[PDB]
Structure formats: C-alpha cells, structure tokens
C-alpha cells in the first residue's frame, strides 16, 4: 500500500525488485505471489478512498482464527485490479501509448519504408566499407537529412532516434542498430530487453529491404540496355531470383499489418493493465516465429539467397558491356547453386508456411521442379 | 512560503527587470551604446586613457547617447580596470561591473558577475574589428580618377576579410543573446533562481567559444584578428607587403574549416558554426 518494505534481516519473501521461491510459504500458491509483487512494484515506481478501505480489510483478516486461502485472494485480487485499472488510464488516455506504438511500427518495423530507400541511396558508399570510429556520426547526418528529404518535419520524436554502430566488440550493415530513448511513464512497458528483440527484427527486415532495392536497380539496367545471345540468361535468372525475394518480402504486410491489427484491438477492449503486458509480450513473440527468424533451417537457407544475390547484381553492374572475360563463366556458377536452393526450400515447405507456399505456387510452376 | 517568496521578488523588487537591463549594458544588446562606448575609446589609440578623469567620465558621456536607460538601473556601471598596460595587437583589458544592493545581492552571485567580465572583454574585442575595418573602408574612400588593377584588386581584400567578421558576429548575435535568452525567460515563469541563473550564463560562456574544451578553436581566431589589424596599419607604395598579408589570411581561414570539422566527431553548439563559415564552398 505504500511502496516500501520494512525488513532488515532478509525476512520478507520479496528482496528492480524480484521474487523468492525457496523461502515462499507452502500452502500459498505461486500465482498470488505474482499478483503481490506487481502491486508493490507498481507503487514504488509510481513514487483518495482506495487507501483506508484496503487497510481495514487487511486488519480484519488478523482477527480470523483460521487463515482461509479462498479469502486471502478475495481481497488481493481487488487491490490488483484497482491499481491496474487506474494505471491503464495513465498508460493510454493521458500518456498516448497508441501514438508511441504507431511511431514504433514506423521506424522499427520499417513502417515508413519510403524513408529507408532514400536513406540507403545516400548512406550506401559510407557503409559498404568496414565500419570505423567515424562512420557512426557520418550516417546520423544522412538519416536526419533523409527525414527532411521527404518533407517529414517534426522536432519531436526526431532526436529520439540515434543510430548506433556496434564497433570494436565485417560490413557496416552487420553492426547497424537503432535505439529509442523511452520516456518515463512508458519505461515500465519498454525495458531494454523488449527493445532488444525489436532491434534484432530491425536488422533482418532492413537486410531484405536492401537486396530488393539494388535488385530492382538491375531490372532498370536491363531495360536501359535495349538495343548478345547469352545476354538473355541474366533476366532469365534475374526475374527468377526476383520472385524468390519479392514474395519473401510479401507475407510481411500479411504478418505485420495483421498481428498489429490484433494488438491494437486487445488494448481498446480490456480495461486491465495486465492484459497489455501479456498481449504485447505475446504480440512480439509471434514476430520472432512467424517471420521465420527463430527456425534455423528457413533462417539458414534464405540467408544464402541474400549474399548470393549481392554477387549477381554487383557482377552485372561492375561492367558496361557483355559478360565476356570470364563473366559468363562466373554467372554459370551461381545458377548451379541457386537453382538447387530453389528446390531445396521447396522441400523444406512440403503451421504458417502455407501462407507462404500459397503465393509461391498459385501459378503451379514449382510443381515442375 | 516559497511561492510568496518568489512572488515577492518579481512584483516588488523587479528581478525580471535587472536581468533584461544588465543585458542592455554588459552583453551590449542595446545598440547606440556599445557603438558609442567602443567608438569613443578607440578614437584615442599609456599614461593617458588610464586616469579616472577620462575613463570614469567617458561612461557618463556614453549613457547620454544611449537613448535607452538613464534609470535607477542605469547607474552603478563602475567602468573600472584591472591592469596597467605599458604600450598592433588585439588586446585592451578593461572590465565593466554591475552593482546591486542587499535583497538582490543574495541571488546574483558575486561570482556570476565576474563571468560576465569574462564574456564582455571578448565582445568588446569584436567591436575593435568592425570599427578598424570600417576605418580602412572609410580611409580608402577619400582616395577616389585613380582606377587601375592595383586599386580594384586591393579593395576586394577588404570585402573578403570583412565578410568573415560579419559572419562570426552574426553567430554570436544568435547564440549568446537570443536562443540562450529564450531559455531562462520562458524557464523562470527560491533555490531554483540560483541554479537557473547559474545555467543561463553558463550556456552563454559555453556557446561563446570561451570554454577551455573548445579553446583551440578560439586560438585560431587571434591569427585572423591580428592580420586584419596589420591590414589597418598599411592605410601603392607597399602593395606587395599587403598582398602577402591577405594570402596568409586566406590560408588561416582555410585551416579553420578543417579544425572545426574534425571537432564534430567528438557538441551540437559548434554544429551551427560550420553552416555559418561554410556556405557554397569547401
């Protein structure tokens, strides 16, 4: 009720506080122990009529000559739901939780994708080289220039995004990261742990957004080269290697704009605060699974398609004429590996892979492989 | 008590007035005063200009040409000194201290006013350029028939050197007088008054390139200010002697743009400087 503990000998079963199990009573269930620790931490971090009534109820229990567990929970569950209801008010109505979530979906989950394609166009040569101690700030001015480049102007929420470079403990993209300075009220919901799993997703989603862009540039390079017999072998493999990434880049609006549609629904329905802490924690857990990141095989197979395509788009752009000096001799090496990986993933597919295979085989082409 | 203590200061003793008044005099915000004080002192230049008969009286002649002041606030401007100069440089040490009474002395610290004297001697030193440089711009006017390559090529140096001073001044007139004054004016509206004031001035000496952290940026400024003074000495008998001087000026300025850039990786205040010194150039 007051956010402080009166203990000096390691007596209470609550020692950023934690919970103790090896000293917890026997008949008391671990469930209600989770309820207690939450109401106490929520007041400590917080630093009318809901005070005296809780006191008398606590005192009344001491007069009962029999501790009935069915009644001990009967008073605690009201107190938990009491502080949670008022906290849910502060977490949504006064402090716009939904507005912050929209900003998250934009910059962390590539929601504002148009900003990141111009960001790549500028911060391209200053990242392909191995990162050093100066490229950390050399790119922040490019990103700031990018937001102003698409007439998105707001002195709010712009200085809250500071790109980091994991240096001295390799290409620059392998160490790129984006941190967000959370405000005070939302600190209870945004720990560095939940902001860490968000950061991992941002690296993978930015990778596939990079390879599709430079690949589309190759498409504009063949079209530009309209007037060699072997010259057609490029687009017969380019357009082939295009559908393996483009469709891989689909199912993402069908997993982001869908899961996000449920999390945005779960808040506007329940008045409790505990629901938010579990639904949001459940919402993020799907992104690790549905986006095929945790599953090593699908994560280890398409991983090779990324860097294999880098060599291809670079090879065709590294020359201005036909691939003659061992260039065609080099193109014939990737197709011997890629075309096998195409059938390899076809065997991996044959819970959610149907939503991916349906788009890949609606035209029934992979049935022939 | 506290709400009645702070309110007692504003509505009765005019704490809001003293701040917006010392800025009119110390930080030289009110024109026609610095342009009249510095303009008088610079007319002379040892034993003269040091006795309390001229420098203790030039102020009482300056305030009349202010057209703003002559109030009980306007007094207490002790135009004293802190050194006896012996004898082309860019230094003339001289202080200018405000004075207060009891119920206000407890807030405005006797150390804070001492730091105004730190930022003042810089701002006065700046005026020494825009007057001496104005002199050669005016000294050359009477020379005008005499039109030749030696003449026009000479005057382009002044326009090339003046613009560098008129941009570093435009910076000072943006950080130490307007944005650092936006804060501490919409910040106020009893212990806090001590710290808020200790944060207003401290930002004024930080954005003012007087901090020892960015001191190497300040050391280079003297090389610029010195060469302009030499340019004033040679008011075409010695043209080439001046042509070498300007070439030294273009080198040092070209060196400043590199030392400030290298000091960006390690201060958002300095960020606006490069945008000032560099614009459509390298």
């Amino acid at each position: 009720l007051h956010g402080l503990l009166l203990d000096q000998h390691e007596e209470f079963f609550i020692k950023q506080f934690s919970l103790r199990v090896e000293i917890l009573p026997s008949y008391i269930p671990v469930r209600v122990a989770e309820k207690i620790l939450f109401v106490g931490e929520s007041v400590q971090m917080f630093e009318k009529n809901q005070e005296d009534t809780f006191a008398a109820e606590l005192h009344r229990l001491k007069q009962q000559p029999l501790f009935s567990l069915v009644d001990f929970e009967q008073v605690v569950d009201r107190i938990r739901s009491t502080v949670a209801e008022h906290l849910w008010k502060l977490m949504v109505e006064e402090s716009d939780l939904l507005g912050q979530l929209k900003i998250i979906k934009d910059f962390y989950l590539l929601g504002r994708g148009e900003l990141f394609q111009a960001f790549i166009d500028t911060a391209q040569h200053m990242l392909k080289t191995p990162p050093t101690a100066v490229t950390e700030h050399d790119v922040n001015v490019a990103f700031q220039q990018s937001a102003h480049k698409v007439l998105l102007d707001d002195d709010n929420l712009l200085p809250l995004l500071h790109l980091t470079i994991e240096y001295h403990g390799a290409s620059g993209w392998a160490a790129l990261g984006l941190s967000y300075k959370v405000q005070w009220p939302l600190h209870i919901l945004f720990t560095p742990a939940v902001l860490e799993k968000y950061n991992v997703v941002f690296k993978y989603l930015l990778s596939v957004r990079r390879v599709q862009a430079e690949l589309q540039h190759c498409w504009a390079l063949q079209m530009q080269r309209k007037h060699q017999t072997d010259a057609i072998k490029w687009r017969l493999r380019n357009h082939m290697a295009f559908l393996v990434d483009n469709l891989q880049y689909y199912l993402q609006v069908d997993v982001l704009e869908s899961q996000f549609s449920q999390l945005l629904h779960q808040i506007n329905s329940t008045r409790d605060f505990e629901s938010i802490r579990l639904a949001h924690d459940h919402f993020l857990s799907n992104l690790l699974a549905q986006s095929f990141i945790l599953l090593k095989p699908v994560f280890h197979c398409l991983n090779e398609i990324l860097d294999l395509c880098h060599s291809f788009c670079s090879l065709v752009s590294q020359n201005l004429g036909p691939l003659d000096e061992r260039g065609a001799a080099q193109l014939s090496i990737l197709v011997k590996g890629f075309s096998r990986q195409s059938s390899l993933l076809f065997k991996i597919l044959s819970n959610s892979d149907l939503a991916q295979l349906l788009l890949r085989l609606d035209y029934n082409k992979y049935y022939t492989q | 008590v506290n709400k009645a203590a702070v309110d007692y200061f504003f509505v009765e003793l005019h704490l809001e007035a003293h701040y917006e008044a010392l800025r009119h005099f110390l930080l030289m915000e009110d024109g026609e005063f610095a342009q009249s004080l510095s303009d008088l002192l610079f007319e002379k230049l040892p034993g003269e200009l040091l006795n309390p008969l001229v420098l203790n009286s030039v102020l009482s002649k300056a305030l009349q040409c202010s057209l703003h002041g002559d109030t009980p606030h306007a007094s207490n401007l002790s135009l004293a000194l802190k050194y006896l100069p012996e004898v082309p440089d860019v230094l003339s040490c001289l202080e200018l201290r405000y004075k207060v009474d009891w119920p206000l002395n407890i807030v405005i610290t006797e150390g804070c006013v001492s730091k105004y004297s730190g930022v003042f001697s810089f701002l006065l030193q700046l005026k020494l350029m825009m007057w001496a440089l104005k002199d050669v711009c005016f000294h050359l006017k009477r020379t005008a028939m005499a039109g030749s390559v030696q003449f026009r090529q000479l005057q382009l140096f002044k326009h090339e050197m003046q613009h560098f001073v008129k941009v570093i001044q435009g910076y000072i007139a943006n950080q130490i007088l307007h944005v650092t004054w936006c804060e501490f004016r919409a910040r106020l509206a009893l212990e806090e008054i001590q710290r808020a004031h200790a944060e207003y001035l401290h930002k004024a000496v930080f954005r003012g390139l007087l901090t020892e952290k960015a001191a190497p940026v300040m050391n280079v400024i003297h090389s610029i200010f010195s060469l302009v003074l030499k340019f004033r000495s040679q008011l075409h008998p010695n043209f080439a002697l001046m042509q070498q001087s300007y070439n030294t000026f273009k080198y040092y300025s070209h060196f400043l743009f590199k030392v400030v850039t290298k000091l960006v990786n390690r201060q958002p205040h300095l960020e606006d400087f490069l945008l000032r010194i560099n614009f459509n150039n390298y």
Partner: protein, 370 residues
C-alpha cells in the same frame, strides 16, 4: 523520387486535367493550389503547391476553368512540327528535371489516333531515350487514315516506352451504355480518371513496399518485349468478394491465352488476415490460366482511401489476349495498303510489330524460351 508528367494531344490534355482535378480533390488542396485545413505523402506529384505538369486551342478551355492558377491530322505533319520546336520545349523539360531532386520517370498521356499525338508523341519518345538514357518512359496511351496513325506509333512504343497501359475506347464506349446509360467524351472521361488515380494509389500513401514506379512494373515485365498491361476497375464486402469480380472479362476494358503476372490494389479497410484465405480458394477454383515455363505469382496490395472525400478495387493484368487488338489494327493496315517520298518507313514498321505479336503468340507455348 518524383515523376514529371507530360500531356500531348487533345485527348491527352483532356484526361490529364480530369486526372488532376481528381488527384487534388483526394488531398486537401484547394483549386487555387493552396492547402485547406479540413500523413498523406504528397511529394510524388506536387512541387513546393504546384503539379509537375507540362501541357502541350484546348489550353484556353483550361485557363477559363476556376482551376486557372493550377500551373494537321496526318502522322507526317505532326512529326515535321516537332523537329521545328525541338529546342523550344526541351528547356521547359530540362529545367523541370534539374529542379527535381532525383527524377525517376516520365508519365505521358497521348492518343495514337490523335493526329498531334501520332506526330508529336512519337518524336519525343526517340528524343527522350537519346537525352536521358536512365529514365523510364511510361505512357497511358489509348487506342481508338486512322489505322496508319496507330501502327506507325506502335513502332515507337515497342522500343522506346519501357512500359505502357492501353485504354481502348471501343470497350469504354460499350461500358458506357450497359452500366452507365449515356447513349459523349465528357462522360466517359469520368471513368478514365478513376483508373489513373487508383493506378498510383500505393505511391501517394506511405506503405511497406511499392514506393516507386519501379516497385510496380518490375514484377510485371519479365522481358523487354513483353511490355503491355491492362487494367480493371470493379466497383461501378470482403477481400474474397472483390477478386472474383476482377478476373471476369465482363469488366476488363478489352475486346492458348493466359496471363503473365497480376497486381491487385485494394483501397479499402478490409481485415488483412483473410486475404490469404481468399487466394487459396482462387487456386482451388482455378479461375485463371498461367504460364508453365517461368515462376510467376499473383500479388495483392493494400492502401487507404482519401479520408477527405466502402471498398474499391483495381487490378493490373499482363495478358497475351492483347495481341489480338494489334492484329485487328494491322489487318486493316494491310487492307488500306492494297487499296490506297520513299514510302519505306511504314514498311519496316509493319515488320517490327510482326515480332511483337510473334513474341506473345510464342509466349503461350511451353517453349517460349529461345
């Protein structure tokens, strides 16, 4: 990445204004080109507000409208005029290119039947490829001495315009009678503007992909030859409801055969979870035939309707049945060739279009490659 739009010929200048009055209406833009009070990314078509247009008798009709502050008939005759105003118009075009930050494409509205279009539209496509070689040139051309203007122009659109969308007036005049009951030009243009507007929906609103003109076309055109598309506008309610009306040829403006790739655009607020359920039943019913040679897929995209102005729908189709329309035209061309300085350019043009119709008829075979 902005797109400079050009409009030539009477038909082209007419559809553009109706495309412009439609676009600025979707945003909060007053006819005086000033924002009204009343997220929507508006940079792709407007310069900081002015639209990046270059309009080329009818101009008087445009300046008399309250939107004033918004800014012979032979193939040989139209071309000759072009070379005479060569330098005059390019300074207008060049200054708009340097003004833009990173110019990406060139939207063109012109009619092959239109004399001015058959003379001036054809000349630009050769010059545009010469001066700026790294810029896509996509045209919203519309099919209708008449066969001559048509085939001679098709000779340029098959090698210069790296993309193209055809709008046939025959099917449009038909749709006007059955589901609109008009019987003029001033009524059929209403639906034309609807197509062009929804065609560029994903670009004007921030999304996940499809943030450039390349983001839409590259999935459709696999080879430099197969570069012809078709559109379909259904609403004249679930996600499965809208798709079953797309594939019906009763709404597609057209008069074995199979597609190449499909792009679906949905402008409603439908639940994006059941879209994967809709595709499954479509593959089960097998409502559209495909190519067996290469890997292809059916795509769908979502966006948001203009709030300041319910589910709509537009589909982008790459069908080989569009080759028949060419044959009909070229058939009439051969008909006038045997009935009536060198008369040789019209001869080679007939040969090069023979390759195009050949490429599509050979595309519907299991051995289209080589």
């Amino acid at each position: 990445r902005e797109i400079i739009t050009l409009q030539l010929g009477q038909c082209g200048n007419q559809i553009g204004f109706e495309f412009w009055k439609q676009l600025c209406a979707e945003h909060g833009i007053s006819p005086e080109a000033i924002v009204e009070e009343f997220t929507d990314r508006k940079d792709v078509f407007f310069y900081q507000y002015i639209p990046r247009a270059v309009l080329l008798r009818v101009i008087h009709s445009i300046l008399n409208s309250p939107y004033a502050k918004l800014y012979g008939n032979n193939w040989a005759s139209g071309f000759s005029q072009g070379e005479k105003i060569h330098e005059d118009i390019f300074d207008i075009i060049d200054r708009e290119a340097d003004g833009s930050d990173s110019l990406e494409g060139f939207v063109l509205c012109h009619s092959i039947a239109g004399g001015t279009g058959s003379g001036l539209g054809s000349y630009l496509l050769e010059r545009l490829n010469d001066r700026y070689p790294k810029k896509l040139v996509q045209t919203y051309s519309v099919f209708p001495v008449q066969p001559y203007n048509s085939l001679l122009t098709l000779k340029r659109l098959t090698q210069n315009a790296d993309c193209l969308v055809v709008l046939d007036n025959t099917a449009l005049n038909r749709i006007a009678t059955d589901r609109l009951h008009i019987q003029s030009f001033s009524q059929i243009n209403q639906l034309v503007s609807t197509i062009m507007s929804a065609s560029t929906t994903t670009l004007r609103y921030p999304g996940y992909m499809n943030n450039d003109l390349i983001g839409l076309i590259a999935s459709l055109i696999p080879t430099p030859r197969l570069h012809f598309l078709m559109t379909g506008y259904t609403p004249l309610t679930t996600v499965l409801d809208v798709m079953r009306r797309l594939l019906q040829p009763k709404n597609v403006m057209v008069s074995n055969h199979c597609y190449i790739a499909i792009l679906n655009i949905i402008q409603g607020e439908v639940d994006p979870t059941q879209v994967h359920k809709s595709l499954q039943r479509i593959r089960e019913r097998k409502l559209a035939n495909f190519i067996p040679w290469g890997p292809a897929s059916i795509q769908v995209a979502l966006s948001r309707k203009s709030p300041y102005l319910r589910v709509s729908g537009l589909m982008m189709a790459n069908h080989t049945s569009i080759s028949s329309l060419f044959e009909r035209t070229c058939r009439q061309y051969d008909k006038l060739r045997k009935r009536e300085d060198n008369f040789d350019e019209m001869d080679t043009s007939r040969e090069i279009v023979q390759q195009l119709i050949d490429e599509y008829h050979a595309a519907t075979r299991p051995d289209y490659i080589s």
